[PDB]
């Protein structure tokens with residue numbers, strides 16, 4: 001099956017009073033492989049809402065109900081979104097005009113994303129006072145997930161941070177009074193019973209090294225993504241621009257090579273007698289190492305010359321930050337540690353001097 005197909009003006013989720021649809025589609029809000037997101041007029045309450053229509057596939061439908069399961073809990077504990085996660089108002093199944101069945105989630109009216117904010121400013125650096133406000137509210141959301149709910153997000157990234165329209169201005173620039181919302185809990189997970197997983201999670205640019213290495217990931221995988229997000233706001237640019245595992249790990253090595261410790265260490269050799277998902281990942285990760293060292297640049301093999309220049313342009317972490325922003329460098333250093341066991345809890349990072 002495929003995605004939903006809509007024209008502006010048609011209605012979603014028909015009911016007895018509105019057989020054409022309770023939610024009148026107003027404008028597109030965003031989309032992706034998961035489905036589509038439309039701004040809608042709730043004909044019942046006569047309020048602005050956002051409806052996320054999920055592509056009629058059980059890969060995405062199962063993720064969607066996982067997101068419903070999480071947002072139901074977050075909404076009950078934190079109804080006014082004190083902890084800045086997106087508020088889900090409703091959920092229903094929309095039987096397509098064409099035949100497919102679509103789960104849809106109803107949300108508070110959504111503003112543009114943090115990625116949208118960056119792109120529209122030509123990926124110019126985000127001012128530190130505004131970066132601080134975004135980081136604090138984001139860290140409050142992550143604290144709410146990890147410690148108040150034992151949930152790991154696994155996909156912290158600028159696209160998954162939305163600006164509340166009230167904080168947004170018609171001149172399309174955010175101040176330090178901006179309010180954010182952490183969104184997209186379909187790839188989230190509950191670690192209350194099984195706290196260590198080995199599935200490949202997170203989008204590539206924000207993926208923590210332990211996910212690539214197969215040593216087992218947990219809540220700390222979100223802190224690394226947070227730290228890469230912060231750097232991205234400070235420079236305007238995506239930190240790790242690579243899709244190859246070996247080169248990606250070397251970019252980590254190059255960036256953190258002057259933070260002492262901080263070296264890419266291979267995972268323990270797995271059982272040859274194990275068809276586990278952990279062993280398979282560690283089996284593939286150990287091919288990127290020769291004798292306990294990351295096999296870069298010899299492991300790329302032409303291309304070894306392109307990887308050498310790309311890694312050479314990768315800046316060292318200290319070099320990125322201006323002298324008057326040493327405190328923000330210190331905060332990020334407790335985030336971008338290669339060993340996940342040295343990363344701080346989000347509650348500890350909220351007490352970091354950068355936030356006072």
Ligand SMILES: [Zn+2]
Nearest residue numbers: 326327330353
């Ligand atoms: Zn300081």
